[PDB]
Coordinates of C-alpha atoms and ligand atoms in Angstrom, one line a residue:
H1 CA -0.4 -0.3 -16.0
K2 CA 0.8 -2.8 -19.1
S3 CA 3.1 -4.4 -16.4
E4 CA 2.1 -4.3 -12.8
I5 CA 5.3 -5.5 -11.8
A6 CA 7.5 -3.3 -13.5
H7 CA 5.0 -0.5 -12.0
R8 CA 5.7 -1.6 -8.5
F9 CA 9.4 -2.0 -9.1
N10 CA 9.6 1.7 -10.6
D11 CA 7.4 3.1 -7.4
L12 CA 9.4 1.1 -4.7
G13 CA 12.7 1.0 -5.9
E14 CA 14.7 -2.3 -5.9
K15 CA 15.8 -2.6 -2.1
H16 CA 12.3 -2.2 -1.0
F17 CA 10.8 -4.4 -3.8
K18 CA 13.3 -7.4 -2.8
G19 CA 12.6 -6.5 0.6
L20 CA 8.9 -6.9 0.6
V21 CA 8.9 -9.8 -2.1
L22 CA 11.2 -11.9 0.5
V23 CA 8.8 -11.0 3.2
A24 CA 5.8 -12.1 1.4
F25 CA 7.3 -15.5 0.3
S26 CA 8.5 -16.0 4.1
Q27 CA 4.8 -15.7 5.2
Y28 CA 3.1 -17.8 2.8
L29 CA 5.8 -20.5 2.9
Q30 CA 7.0 -20.3 6.5
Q31 CA 9.3 -23.7 6.7
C32 CA 11.6 -23.2 3.8
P33 CA 15.3 -22.5 4.2
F34 CA 16.5 -18.8 3.5
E35 CA 18.2 -20.2 0.3
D36 CA 15.0 -21.2 -1.3
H37 CA 13.4 -18.0 -0.6
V38 CA 16.7 -15.5 -1.5
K39 CA 17.0 -17.6 -5.0
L40 CA 12.8 -17.1 -5.5
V41 CA 13.3 -13.2 -4.6
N42 CA 16.3 -13.1 -6.9
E43 CA 14.6 -14.4 -9.8
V44 CA 11.3 -12.3 -9.2
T45 CA 13.3 -9.2 -9.1
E46 CA 15.3 -10.1 -12.3
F47 CA 12.0 -10.6 -14.1
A48 CA 10.7 -7.2 -12.8
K49 CA 14.0 -5.5 -13.9
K50 CA 13.5 -7.0 -17.6
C51 CA 10.0 -5.9 -17.7
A52 CA 10.6 -2.6 -16.4
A53 CA 13.2 -2.5 -19.5
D54 CA 10.4 -3.5 -22.0
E55 CA 6.6 -3.9 -20.6
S56 CA 5.5 -5.7 -23.8
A57 CA 7.8 -8.9 -23.1
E58 CA 5.9 -12.1 -22.8
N59 CA 4.5 -12.8 -19.0
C60 CA 5.1 -9.0 -18.0
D61 CA 1.5 -8.5 -18.4
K62 CA 0.6 -11.4 -15.7
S63 CA -1.1 -10.3 -12.7
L64 CA 0.9 -10.4 -9.4
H65 CA -0.7 -13.1 -7.7
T66 CA -0.3 -15.1 -11.2
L67 CA 3.5 -14.2 -11.4
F68 CA 4.2 -14.9 -7.2
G69 CA 1.9 -17.6 -7.3
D70 CA 3.7 -19.5 -10.0
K71 CA 6.9 -19.1 -8.4
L72 CA 5.9 -20.3 -5.0
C73 CA 4.3 -23.5 -6.7
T74 CA 7.9 -23.9 -8.2
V75 CA 9.5 -24.6 -4.9
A76 CA 11.8 -27.7 -4.1
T77 CA 10.2 -30.5 -1.7
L78 CA 6.5 -28.8 -1.9
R79 CA 4.3 -32.0 -1.3
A80 CA 6.5 -33.1 1.7
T81 CA 7.3 -30.0 3.3
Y82 CA 4.0 -28.0 2.2
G83 CA 1.1 -30.7 1.7
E84 CA -1.8 -28.3 1.9
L85 CA 0.0 -25.5 -0.4
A86 CA 0.6 -28.2 -3.0
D87 CA -3.0 -28.8 -3.0
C88 CA -3.4 -24.8 -3.7
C89 CA -1.0 -24.9 -6.6
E90 CA -3.7 -26.7 -8.7
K91 CA -5.9 -24.0 -8.8
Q92 CA -5.9 -20.9 -11.1
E93 CA -6.0 -17.3 -9.7
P94 CA -7.7 -15.9 -7.6
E95 CA -8.6 -19.1 -6.2
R96 CA -5.3 -20.3 -5.4
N97 CA -4.1 -16.9 -3.6
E98 CA -7.2 -17.6 -1.4
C99 CA -6.4 -21.2 -0.8
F100 CA -2.6 -19.7 0.1
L101 CA -4.1 -17.2 2.5
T102 CA -6.3 -19.7 4.1
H103 CA -3.5 -21.5 5.3
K104 CA -1.0 -19.4 6.9
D105 CA 0.0 -20.6 10.4
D106 CA -0.4 -18.2 13.2
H107 CA 1.4 -20.8 15.6
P108 CA 4.3 -22.2 13.6
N109 CA 6.6 -23.0 17.0
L110 CA 10.0 -22.2 15.6
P111 CA 13.0 -21.8 17.9
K112 CA 13.3 -18.1 19.7
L113 CA 15.5 -15.9 18.0
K114 CA 18.2 -15.8 20.5
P115 CA 20.9 -13.1 19.9
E116 CA 24.4 -14.2 19.8
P117 CA 26.2 -11.2 19.6
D118 CA 29.7 -12.3 18.4
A119 CA 28.4 -14.8 15.6
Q120 CA 26.0 -12.1 14.5
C121 CA 28.1 -9.1 14.1
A122 CA 30.5 -11.4 12.2
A123 CA 27.8 -12.4 9.6
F124 CA 26.8 -8.8 9.7
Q125 CA 30.7 -7.2 8.7
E126 CA 31.2 -10.1 6.0
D127 CA 27.7 -9.8 4.4
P128 CA 25.0 -7.3 5.5
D129 CA 22.6 -7.7 2.7
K130 CA 22.5 -11.7 4.0
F131 CA 22.4 -10.6 7.5
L132 CA 19.7 -8.2 7.3
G133 CA 17.8 -10.2 4.6
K134 CA 17.6 -13.3 7.1
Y135 CA 16.1 -10.9 9.9
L136 CA 13.2 -9.9 7.3
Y137 CA 12.9 -13.6 6.7
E138 CA 13.0 -15.0 10.6
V139 CA 10.7 -12.4 11.6
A140 CA 8.3 -12.8 8.8
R141 CA 7.9 -16.4 8.9
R142 CA 7.2 -16.2 12.6
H143 CA 4.6 -13.8 12.2
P144 CA 3.0 -14.3 8.8
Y145 CA 0.5 -11.4 9.1
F146 CA 3.2 -8.8 9.7
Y147 CA 2.8 -5.6 8.1
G148 CA 5.4 -5.6 5.3
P149 CA 6.4 -1.9 5.3
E150 CA 6.5 -1.7 9.0
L151 CA 9.3 -5.1 8.9
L152 CA 11.6 -3.2 6.6
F153 CA 11.3 -0.1 8.8
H154 CA 12.0 -2.3 11.8
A155 CA 14.9 -3.9 9.6
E156 CA 16.8 -0.7 9.7
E157 CA 16.4 -0.3 13.2
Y158 CA 18.2 -3.9 13.4
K159 CA 20.8 -2.7 11.0
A160 CA 21.5 0.7 13.1
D161 CA 21.8 -1.4 16.6
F162 CA 24.5 -3.7 14.5
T163 CA 26.4 -1.1 13.2
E164 CA 26.2 1.2 16.4
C165 CA 27.5 -1.7 18.6
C166 CA 29.7 -4.1 16.9
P167 CA 32.6 -1.8 16.8
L168 CA 27.9 -6.9 23.5
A169 CA 26.0 -5.2 26.5
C170 CA 25.4 -2.4 24.0
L171 CA 23.5 -4.9 21.7
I172 CA 21.2 -7.0 24.0
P173 CA 19.0 -4.3 25.5
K174 CA 18.7 -2.8 22.0
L175 CA 17.7 -5.9 20.5
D176 CA 15.4 -7.0 23.7
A177 CA 13.7 -3.4 23.1
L178 CA 12.9 -4.1 19.5
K179 CA 11.6 -7.5 19.9
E180 CA 8.9 -6.0 22.3
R181 CA 8.3 -3.6 19.4
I182 CA 8.0 -6.3 16.8
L183 CA 5.6 -8.3 19.5
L184 CA 3.3 -5.3 19.7
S185 CA 3.4 -4.3 16.1
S186 CA 2.9 -8.0 15.0
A187 CA -0.6 -8.1 17.8
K188 CA -1.7 -4.6 16.3
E189 CA -1.7 -5.8 12.8
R190 CA -3.2 -9.2 13.1
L191 CA -6.2 -7.8 14.9
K192 CA -6.9 -5.5 11.8
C193 CA -6.6 -8.8 9.5
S194 CA -8.5 -10.8 12.0
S195 CA -11.3 -7.9 12.0
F196 CA -11.6 -8.2 8.0
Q197 CA -11.5 -12.1 8.0
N198 CA -14.0 -12.0 11.1
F199 CA -16.3 -9.2 11.1
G200 CA -15.5 -7.2 7.4
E201 CA -14.4 -4.0 6.2
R202 CA -17.2 -2.0 7.6
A203 CA -16.0 -3.0 11.2
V204 CA -12.4 -2.1 10.1
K205 CA -13.6 1.2 8.9
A206 CA -15.4 2.0 12.0
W207 CA -12.4 0.9 14.5
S208 CA -10.2 3.2 12.3
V209 CA -12.7 6.1 12.4
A210 CA -13.0 6.1 15.9
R211 CA -8.9 5.9 16.7
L212 CA -8.0 8.3 13.6
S213 CA -10.7 10.6 15.2
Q214 CA -9.1 10.3 18.4
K215 CA -5.5 11.0 16.8
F216 CA -6.5 13.9 14.6
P217 CA -9.4 15.8 16.3
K218 CA -8.8 18.9 14.2
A219 CA -9.5 17.3 11.0
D220 CA -13.1 17.5 9.4
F221 CA -15.2 14.3 8.7
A222 CA -14.3 14.4 4.9
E223 CA -10.6 14.6 5.9
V224 CA -11.0 11.5 8.2
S225 CA -13.2 9.7 5.9
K226 CA -10.7 10.1 3.3
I227 CA -7.8 8.4 5.4
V228 CA -10.1 5.8 6.7
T229 CA -10.7 5.1 3.1
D230 CA -7.5 4.7 1.8
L231 CA -5.8 3.1 5.2
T232 CA -8.7 0.6 5.3
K233 CA -7.6 -0.3 1.5
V234 CA -3.6 -0.5 2.6
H235 CA -4.5 -3.0 5.4
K236 CA -7.1 -5.0 3.0
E237 CA -3.9 -5.3 0.6
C238 CA -1.6 -6.3 3.2
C239 CA -3.4 -8.7 4.8
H240 CA -4.4 -10.6 1.8
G241 CA -0.6 -10.9 0.8
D242 CA -0.5 -7.8 -1.8
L243 CA 2.5 -6.2 -0.5
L244 CA 3.8 -4.4 -3.2
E245 CA 0.5 -2.5 -3.9
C246 CA 0.3 -2.3 0.0
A247 CA 3.5 -0.7 0.5
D248 CA 2.9 1.7 -2.4
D249 CA -0.7 2.9 -1.3
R250 CA 0.9 3.3 2.0
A251 CA 3.7 5.8 1.1
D252 CA 0.9 7.5 -1.3
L253 CA -1.1 8.1 2.0
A254 CA 1.7 9.1 4.0
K255 CA 2.4 11.9 1.5
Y256 CA -1.4 12.7 1.3
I257 CA -1.4 13.3 5.1
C258 CA 2.0 15.0 5.0
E259 CA 0.8 17.6 2.2
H260 CA -2.3 18.6 4.5
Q261 CA -0.8 18.6 8.0
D262 CA -2.1 21.7 8.9
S263 CA -5.6 20.8 8.0
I264 CA -5.2 17.3 9.7
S265 CA -3.0 17.5 13.0
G266 CA -0.2 19.8 14.6
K267 CA 1.7 16.5 15.7
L268 CA 2.6 15.5 12.4
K269 CA 5.3 17.8 11.7
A270 CA 8.1 15.8 13.5
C271 CA 7.0 12.9 11.2
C272 CA 6.5 14.8 8.1
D273 CA 10.3 15.9 7.5
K274 CA 11.7 12.3 7.3
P275 CA 12.3 9.2 4.7
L276 CA 9.4 7.3 3.2
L277 CA 9.5 4.5 5.4
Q278 CA 10.4 6.6 8.7
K279 CA 7.6 8.9 7.8
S280 CA 4.8 6.3 7.2
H281 CA 6.2 5.0 10.9
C282 CA 5.7 8.0 12.8
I283 CA 2.2 8.8 11.3
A284 CA 1.0 5.5 12.5
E285 CA 2.5 6.1 16.0
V286 CA 1.5 9.6 16.2
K287 CA 0.4 11.1 19.4
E288 CA -3.1 12.5 19.6
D289 CA -3.4 16.1 18.9
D290 CA -4.8 18.4 21.6
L291 CA -8.6 19.2 21.5
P292 CA -9.6 22.1 19.2
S293 CA -11.4 25.1 21.3
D294 CA -14.5 24.6 18.7
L295 CA -15.7 21.3 19.1
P296 CA -19.2 21.5 18.5
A297 CA -22.2 20.7 21.2
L298 CA -23.4 17.1 20.1
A299 CA -26.9 17.1 22.0
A300 CA -28.6 19.2 19.5
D301 CA -27.7 17.4 16.5
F302 CA -28.0 13.9 17.8
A303 CA -30.1 14.0 20.7
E304 CA -32.6 17.0 20.0
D305 CA -33.0 17.5 16.3
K306 CA -36.9 16.9 15.6
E307 CA -36.0 15.2 12.4
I308 CA -33.5 12.4 13.8
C309 CA -35.6 9.2 12.6
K310 CA -35.7 10.6 9.0
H311 CA -32.1 11.2 9.0
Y312 CA -31.2 7.8 10.2
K313 CA -33.6 6.3 7.2
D314 CA -32.5 8.4 4.6
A315 CA -28.6 8.9 5.0
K316 CA -27.7 6.3 7.8
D317 CA -24.3 5.5 7.1
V318 CA -23.4 9.1 7.2
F319 CA -25.4 9.9 10.3
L320 CA -23.6 7.3 12.2
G321 CA -20.2 7.9 10.7
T322 CA -20.1 11.3 11.8
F323 CA -21.6 10.6 15.3
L324 CA -19.0 8.1 15.7
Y325 CA -16.5 10.6 14.1
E326 CA -17.6 13.6 16.8
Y327 CA -18.1 11.5 19.5
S328 CA -14.4 9.8 19.1
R329 CA -12.4 13.1 18.6
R330 CA -14.1 14.6 22.0
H331 CA -13.0 11.1 24.1
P332 CA -9.6 10.4 23.7
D333 CA -9.8 9.3 27.2
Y334 CA -12.2 6.3 26.1
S335 CA -10.7 3.0 24.4
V336 CA -11.4 2.2 20.6
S337 CA -13.9 -0.6 21.6
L338 CA -16.0 1.6 24.1
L339 CA -16.3 4.1 21.4
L340 CA -17.6 1.3 19.1
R341 CA -20.1 0.0 21.5
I342 CA -21.2 3.6 22.3
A343 CA -21.9 3.8 18.6
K344 CA -23.8 0.3 18.3
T345 CA -26.1 1.5 21.3
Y346 CA -26.6 5.3 19.5
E347 CA -28.1 3.0 16.5
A348 CA -29.8 0.5 18.4
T349 CA -31.9 3.7 20.4
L350 CA -32.7 5.2 16.9
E351 CA -34.0 1.7 15.8
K352 CA -35.8 1.4 18.6
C353 CA -37.4 4.7 19.4
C354 CA -38.3 5.4 15.7
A355 CA -40.8 2.4 15.7
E356 CA -42.8 3.7 18.6
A357 CA -45.7 6.3 18.4
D358 CA -43.7 9.4 19.8
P359 CA -39.8 9.0 18.8
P360 CA -38.4 12.5 19.9
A361 CA -39.4 12.0 23.6
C362 CA -38.0 8.3 23.3
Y363 CA -34.5 9.2 21.7
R364 CA -34.0 12.6 24.0
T365 CA -32.0 10.4 26.5
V366 CA -29.8 8.5 24.1
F367 CA -26.5 10.0 25.7
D368 CA -27.6 8.9 29.2
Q369 CA -27.6 5.2 27.8
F370 CA -23.9 5.6 27.4
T371 CA -23.0 6.6 31.1
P372 CA -22.9 2.6 32.2
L373 CA -20.9 1.7 29.2
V374 CA -18.3 4.0 30.2
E375 CA -18.3 3.2 33.8
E376 CA -17.8 -0.6 33.5
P377 CA -14.4 -0.5 31.8
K378 CA -13.3 2.5 34.1
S379 CA -14.1 0.2 37.0
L380 CA -12.3 -2.8 35.6
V381 CA -9.0 -0.7 35.0
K382 CA -8.8 0.9 38.3
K383 CA -9.7 -2.4 40.0
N384 CA -6.7 -4.2 37.8
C385 CA -4.3 -1.4 38.6
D386 CA -5.2 -1.1 42.0
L387 CA -4.1 -5.0 42.3
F388 CA -0.9 -4.7 40.0
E389 CA 0.3 -1.8 42.1
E390 CA -0.1 -3.9 45.4
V391 CA 1.2 -7.3 44.1
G392 CA 3.7 -6.5 41.3
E393 CA 3.7 -8.3 37.9
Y394 CA 4.6 -11.9 38.5
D395 CA 1.5 -12.1 41.0
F396 CA -0.8 -9.8 38.9
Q397 CA 0.2 -12.3 35.9
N398 CA -0.9 -15.4 38.4
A399 CA -4.1 -13.5 39.5
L400 CA -5.2 -13.2 35.5
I401 CA -3.7 -17.0 35.0
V402 CA -6.4 -17.7 37.6
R403 CA -9.1 -15.8 36.4
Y404 CA -8.5 -17.1 32.7
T405 CA -8.1 -20.8 33.5
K406 CA -11.6 -20.5 35.4
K407 CA -13.1 -19.2 32.4
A408 CA -11.8 -21.5 29.8
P409 CA -10.2 -24.7 31.8
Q410 CA -10.3 -26.8 28.2
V411 CA -7.6 -24.3 26.8
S412 CA -4.0 -25.3 26.7
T413 CA -1.3 -24.7 29.5
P414 CA 1.0 -22.9 27.1
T415 CA -1.7 -20.9 25.7
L416 CA -3.6 -20.0 29.3
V417 CA 0.2 -18.8 30.4
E418 CA 1.1 -16.6 27.4
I419 CA -2.2 -14.9 27.6
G420 CA -2.1 -14.4 31.5
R421 CA 1.4 -13.3 31.0
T422 CA 0.8 -10.8 28.0
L423 CA -2.4 -9.5 30.0
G424 CA -0.4 -8.9 33.0
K425 CA 2.4 -6.7 31.0
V426 CA -0.5 -4.5 30.1
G427 CA -0.6 -3.5 33.9
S428 CA 3.0 -2.6 33.8
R429 CA 2.4 -0.7 30.4
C430 CA -0.6 1.2 31.3
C431 CA -0.9 1.4 35.1
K432 CA 1.6 4.0 35.5
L433 CA 0.6 6.3 32.7
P434 CA -1.3 9.6 33.3
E435 CA -4.7 8.7 34.8
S436 CA -6.6 9.8 31.6
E437 CA -4.4 7.5 29.7
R438 CA -5.0 4.1 31.5
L439 CA -8.2 3.4 30.1
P440 CA -7.6 3.6 26.5
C441 CA -4.0 1.8 27.1
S442 CA -5.5 -1.1 28.8
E443 CA -8.5 -1.8 27.2
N444 CA -6.7 -1.3 23.5
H445 CA -3.9 -3.7 24.8
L446 CA -6.4 -6.3 25.8
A447 CA -8.1 -6.1 22.5
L448 CA -4.5 -7.7 21.2
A449 CA -4.2 -10.4 24.0
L450 CA -7.9 -11.5 23.3
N451 CA -7.3 -11.5 19.5
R452 CA -4.6 -13.9 19.8
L453 CA -6.3 -16.1 22.3
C454 CA -9.1 -15.8 19.5
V455 CA -6.9 -16.6 16.6
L456 CA -5.1 -19.5 18.6
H457 CA -8.6 -21.0 19.0
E458 CA -9.5 -20.9 15.4
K459 CA -6.9 -23.8 14.8
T460 CA -7.2 -25.5 17.9
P461 CA -11.3 -25.0 19.3
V462 CA -11.7 -26.4 22.6
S463 CA -14.7 -24.0 24.1
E464 CA -18.0 -23.0 23.0
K465 CA -18.2 -19.8 25.5
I466 CA -14.7 -18.9 23.7
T467 CA -16.1 -19.5 20.2
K468 CA -19.1 -17.2 21.1
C469 CA -17.2 -14.3 22.8
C470 CA -14.5 -14.4 19.7
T471 CA -16.9 -14.7 16.7
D472 CA -20.3 -12.8 18.1
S473 CA -19.1 -9.1 17.9
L474 CA -15.7 -7.1 17.8
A475 CA -17.0 -4.4 20.0
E476 CA -18.5 -6.6 22.7
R477 CA -15.4 -9.0 22.9
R478 CA -13.7 -7.5 26.0
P479 CA -17.0 -7.3 28.1
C480 CA -18.0 -11.1 27.0
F481 CA -14.8 -12.4 28.3
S482 CA -14.9 -10.2 31.3
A483 CA -18.5 -11.7 31.9
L484 CA -17.2 -15.4 31.7
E485 CA -17.5 -17.1 35.2
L486 CA -15.9 -21.0 36.3
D487 CA -17.2 -23.1 33.5
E488 CA -19.6 -25.0 35.5
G489 CA -19.9 -27.9 32.7
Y490 CA -16.2 -28.8 32.8
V491 CA -15.0 -31.8 34.6
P492 CA -12.0 -31.4 36.5
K493 CA -8.8 -32.5 34.8
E494 CA -7.3 -35.9 36.4
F495 CA -4.7 -35.7 39.0
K496 CA -1.1 -36.4 37.5
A497 CA 1.4 -36.0 40.3
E498 CA 4.5 -35.4 37.7
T499 CA 2.8 -32.3 36.3
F500 CA 3.2 -30.8 39.9
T501 CA 6.8 -32.3 40.5
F502 CA 9.8 -30.1 40.0
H503 CA 13.3 -31.1 39.6
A504 CA 16.8 -29.5 39.5
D505 CA 16.5 -28.6 36.1
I506 CA 14.6 -25.4 36.9
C507 CA 17.3 -24.0 38.9
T508 CA 19.7 -23.0 35.9
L509 CA 17.0 -21.3 34.0
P510 CA 16.6 -17.4 33.6
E511 CA 14.2 -15.8 35.8
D512 CA 11.4 -15.6 33.1
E513 CA 11.7 -19.1 32.2
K514 CA 11.6 -20.5 36.0
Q515 CA 8.3 -18.1 36.6
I516 CA 6.7 -19.9 33.2
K517 CA 7.3 -23.3 34.9
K518 CA 5.4 -22.6 38.0
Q519 CA 2.8 -20.5 36.1
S520 CA 2.3 -23.6 34.2
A521 CA 1.7 -25.7 37.4
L522 CA -0.5 -22.8 38.8
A523 CA -2.9 -23.2 35.3
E524 CA -2.8 -27.3 35.9
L525 CA -3.7 -26.6 39.8
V526 CA -6.8 -24.8 38.8
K527 CA -7.5 -27.2 36.1
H528 CA -7.7 -30.3 38.6
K529 CA -9.5 -27.9 41.3
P530 CA -11.6 -25.3 39.6
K531 CA -13.5 -24.4 42.4
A532 CA -10.6 -23.6 44.6
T533 CA -10.2 -19.6 45.5
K534 CA -7.7 -17.4 44.1
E535 CA -6.5 -17.1 47.7
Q536 CA -6.2 -20.8 48.1
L537 CA -4.1 -20.7 44.9
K538 CA -1.8 -18.3 45.6
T539 CA -0.8 -19.5 48.9
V540 CA -0.3 -23.4 47.3
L541 CA 1.8 -21.6 44.7
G542 CA 3.7 -19.7 47.6
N543 CA 4.6 -23.0 49.1
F544 CA 5.7 -24.5 45.5
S545 CA 8.2 -21.1 45.2
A546 CA 9.6 -21.6 48.4
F547 CA 10.3 -25.2 48.0
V548 CA 12.1 -24.2 44.5
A549 CA 14.0 -21.3 46.1
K550 CA 15.2 -23.8 48.8
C551 CA 16.4 -26.8 46.8
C552 CA 18.0 -24.7 44.2
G553 CA 19.9 -23.1 47.0
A554 CA 20.9 -26.6 48.6
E555 CA 24.3 -28.1 48.3
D556 CA 22.5 -31.4 46.8
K557 CA 19.8 -30.2 44.5
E558 CA 17.9 -33.4 43.3
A559 CA 17.8 -35.1 46.7
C560 CA 16.4 -32.1 47.9
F561 CA 13.7 -32.2 45.0
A562 CA 13.1 -36.2 45.6
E563 CA 12.9 -35.8 49.2
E564 CA 10.8 -32.8 49.7
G565 CA 8.9 -32.8 46.3
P566 CA 6.3 -35.7 46.8
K567 CA 5.1 -34.3 50.2
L568 CA 4.4 -30.8 48.7
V569 CA 2.6 -32.6 45.7
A570 CA -0.2 -34.5 47.9
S571 CA -0.6 -31.8 50.8
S572 CA -1.1 -29.0 47.9
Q573 CA -4.4 -31.0 46.8
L574 CA -5.6 -31.1 50.2
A575 CA -5.2 -27.2 50.4
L576 CA -7.2 -26.9 47.3
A577 CA -10.6 -28.5 48.5
Ligands
ZN601 ZN1 -1.7 -1.8 -12.3
ZN602 ZN1 9.6 1.4 0.2
ZN603 ZN1 13.0 -26.7 -1.2
ZN604 ZN1 8.7 -12.8 16.9
ZN605 ZN1 6.8 -0.2 14.4
ZN606 ZN1 -1.6 0.4 9.1
ZN607 ZN1 -5.1 -9.7 -3.7
ZN608 ZN1 -32.1 17.3 11.5
ZN609 ZN1 -0.8 1.4 23.5
ZN610 ZN1 10.4 -30.9 36.1
ZN611 ZN1 11.5 -16.0 40.5

């Protein structure tokens, strides 16, 4: 390609090209106002058009990283607003880009995007482009690793919502639903980027082999391998800020899947007769195909063949990749990480056994090594769903907050509350599902919440136990966290009465925000009395809840808090001994 920018502009079209460039700049530079970005986008886009007209024109042959980085490095008030990035701007490519990537903020702490129906409907109708641009901008800076094409898809849902409703109780629940999809989608992609960063491309491929084999059990190993190879490149590119290349390659992949859908899956038909953005999205979210009737017996190949040790030495990556493909397509009832743990156990067995005198007798029972690995997460999910269904989301979240605060009492209270609340919503999502889909739902979603915690820990490390669980092994991460008990080396956080002291401000809050305040106090209760049982803590929190409900129902709210509060604060400590 004579001009890469021209090529991507021609492939993607202007609207998508501008959208993706806006996303990319909003993620690299998270604090800049919407005007600093829009101007940069418009200027970049004008240059692309010029280059599309004449690819020999000066600067058109430069790399995307060079052009985009140079643009970012012109931004007004760079050192004051983006101290670390200004340092990156002294470098050449690709060092500069790598510097930009190293400095993306996963916890930027900006205001919650609260919907104002009247104000936004008014801004939408006067200038939709600006309004929809703003949505891309607001979400991108909040979620710096958000999948670029996915955000454009979600912007179009945002548009349909405002197009439908504006001509305001229509609008609020539509945006609530969309926000949950943004949260989930953001968490899924961040896991992919986190996997590249912390474990590498092999780990992302193995994860993808397992997942895609589950989704497309009809497809042969060549087809799955093909799709995994291409999908891994798409994510590598999107995770490293190469959003034009990422979008273009995602579009080509969707086309290939759809051209070969009879070979791949019967569920793709609904997806494949749609527009480019919608198509790629439906495929990424597609449900698992029905099991084929001709799935092969695996014992003969992987347990009983006499030349297995030779296979493992001569064509290791293919023998193991094939096993993972075969075992995964057969087990849609397993979580992805379980499948990965199974694959690692299979590999370790063929190392151990082949170094013995008589290997066949050794590796013959290899499938029986999987049994305890399957039973552990099955029991965990049964136990957590039993609790959820008994006590409901709020108390379930509370139990998880206690559980995780005991494991990592050095973690910040907002982080512990966030993660406990997220973990508890997994119950609501997964426990009601058909019984065979609970395990994959529960563990896969758990992987997302644990990765969020790990990502926050990269920025703000407080705990060696957390470091170990986050960095030792991607497949073993959930069981590593599950095996943590009360950190015995923790010295209890000192008592501050005011931490547990409530005031009449709580009464005006929305329900979820009242809960967060009480849940924060719950975390703090555990930090000061780490040996207190979950049953002690539930009772103490019950008493706090009753006290809040009483004084919020009072004629004089603050006199109630001022009278009743200090007694409850002192007595509650005696209950936690
Ligand atoms: Zn090229
Ligand atoms: Zn597009
Ligand atoms: Zn500026
Ligand atoms: Zn968000
Ligand atoms: Zn989505
Ligand atoms: Zn993807
Ligand atoms: Zn790149
Ligand atoms: Zn053989
Ligand atoms: Zn799910
Ligand atoms: Zn207060
Ligand atoms: Zn409440």
